[model samples]
Structures are given as C-alpha cells and as structure tokens.
Target: EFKDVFIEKQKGEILGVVIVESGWGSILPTVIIANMMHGGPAEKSGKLNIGDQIMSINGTSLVGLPLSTCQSIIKGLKNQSRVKLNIVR
Candidate 1:
C-alpha cells in the first residue's frame, strides 16, 4: 500500500478516471483502475495505473464496497485542492 496527495482543478466530470472490481478473490477488498481520462487527475498522478487497486482513501478501507459508496467517498471530496489517496498496486 501507498499514499499520495492530489490537487484537483476541474469539475463536472470524473477525475479523468474509471474504476472497477479487481476480481482477485472473495477475500480481497479493492477496486481496479479500468481507465483514465487524458490529462486527468488520475493520469496526472503518475502513480495510478489501469490495474492498480485502490484499497482505501485517507485510511478508510473500500474493500467489497459498492461503486456508489466509493464514488461518494471520492466525489464528496470536491472543492478540496489537496487530498490523500491510499492504494495498492
């Protein structure tokens, strides 16, 4: 696991990213980066990848959680320029 802080600028769309279940197994709790928007935050991070698994954010675990909930955790964090992302690749 690793963590980093990102500065957001744009709005009305995703962070230039897409995520989905990793399907690693029944016990693992994580989501994979399915795609990223060009020049998007996820891509701009330079640390995220297509197969990267996001395990948590700000130390909150996201394993086996619904996408909506995940989006809530992320989307709810709008207007904040700097935020920490915890992930496992």
Candidate 2:
C-alpha cells in the first residue's frame, strides 16, 4: 500500500528517521526506514514505521536513486518546516 504523510516541525529540526538500503543483492534497491529516534519528529508523527519504504520526499522521487542520494534528500529537509513523504509498505 502507498501512503502520503505530512510532517510539520520547526525549521532546521531533524526528522530523526534512519534509512537503509534494502534489496542490496538484487537488481532493485529501495530506501526503507530502519529506525527512528525515541521522541523525534518521525516518531511524534505516528504515521511512519520501521520497514516502510520511502518513495519520495517533498515531491522529489527517490526511485532508483542511490542510498546516499536518498539520505541526502531526507537530510535536506531539515531547512523546511513542512515535509511530505510518499511511502509504501
């Protein structure tokens, strides 16, 4: 299933979500939520979960992108107060 979640936080605040690349030995690789901070924005939203695949962030598609690039995309969101995540589980 696919879902769109919106998270609102203070500008410069981190999402506190950790990501890892799945399907490493296969042709296709995906970015999945591996962990989250105990009381950070991601956990506070209550809409994300470990093992959920992130398809995009703030309208930018992450499909077929490298893990480092995906991490960079998520890291860049710290400057924005609102973030939109497209995820699949």
Candidate 3:
C-alpha cells in the first residue's frame, strides 16, 4: 500500500493539504492527510487521499516524526515547484 506521488505547482503556491497525527498510543505514530483544499496542489494532483499516510517528502523520511515536525517539513516546501511524496494508504 505504499507508492510515490509527484505534485507539480507554481513556485510559492501552497500544497494545500492538512496533516494530523494518527495511530496515537501505538509504537509508531504516523502523519496522515486530514484534508485537502479544493483546487489546491494536493487536490489537483489527484494522487492523494484523506487517510493517506505521508511517509516522506523529497526523500526525507517522516516515519515516527511528530505532527508539528512534519508540518514544518511540508511548510518548508512552499517555494519549491515540484514535490515528491511517498505515501501509504
């Protein structure tokens, strides 16, 4: 249930995806896509889903990372035009 997805967008455009911590109280909590903004990069790509787990961004492993840290990682990609995401469904 793991695959890679690439999203292309204009520079300075947001990914327009919201993430939240899932699997709390488990050995490894994961970050999942909570929602996506309409007409945004995440939605436009048509490769992401609400319950998809984001495993990485640009090859950086996000497994077991905190929610805020993952948010920062995603936020830091705002200026990049191309984003590579590893996701788990």
Candidate 4:
C-alpha cells in the first residue's frame, strides 16, 4: 500500500494519481508536486515550461514561502486569494 495519495484533474481528465514505476525522482535544486501537475493551467497559459522557474506570483515573492505556506498560497481556497511567488520547476 502507499503512504500518500493524490487526485488530479487535468484538462477535464481526472486521472488517478499514482506513480507506477519505482525510484523515480527529480534532480537537485528542483522538484514538482502532484497538484501543480494535475491541472495544466500554467501550461495552458503558454508561458511556462516543465523546467521553467516561476519568479513571481501576483507581485509577491516565493523566496520565503515555507512548504505549508506555498500550498496555502497556491490553493487560495478562501476566495479571491492571491500570491506572488518565485517558482522554479
């Protein structure tokens, strides 16, 4: 069994999140989370690439956004939420 799980809806495709292969990971100084990949909103914007670094979001900086804060900022589930981030994919 897996310890953590995720659900992603990409371009109207709701895929069951699970990495079939083993020992897969990113190189140093870079990492991607499940939620970001699921919905290709950034990709659809046609301004970002897989390895592109997001330098800012909504005029805010991502340098000091802790892991939990990053998620919260990205989610902005409370409505009219916004954040400025320096993202590195």
Over 1-89, each residue of candidate 3 has an lDDT whose tens digit, in order, gives 77686778888877877778877454345778888777788888888877678888889777878888888877887889977988776
Better of 2 and 3 by TM-score: 3
RMSD of candidate 3 to true structure, Å: 2.1
Candidate 2 residues lying further than 4 Å off, grouped into runs, are: 24-28
lDDT of each: 0.64, 0.77, 0.79, 0.34
lDDT of 1 by residue, 1-89 (tens): 56463636455444544567668664375677677666767777777776667777656677878777776766755555544667775
- The model with the greater TM-score, 3 or 4, is 3
Tens-place lDDT digits, model 4, residues 1-89:
11111222234332211111112354233223333343344433433334443333444443445445444444542232222233444
Against the hidden reference, what TM-scores do the models get? 0.71, 0.86, 0.87, 0.41
Ranking by lDDT: 3, 2, 1, 4
- For this target, which candidate reaches the highest TM-score against the unseen true structure? 3
Q: Which 10 consecutive positions of candidate 2 have the poorest summed lDDT?
A: 21-30
What C-alpha lDDT does candidate 3 achieve relative to the native structure? Answer: 0.79
Error of 4 at 28 (Å): 14
Who wins the lDDT comparison?
A: 3
lDDT of 2: 0.77
- Candidate 3 worst ten-residue window by lDDT: 22-31
lDDT of 4 at 60: 40
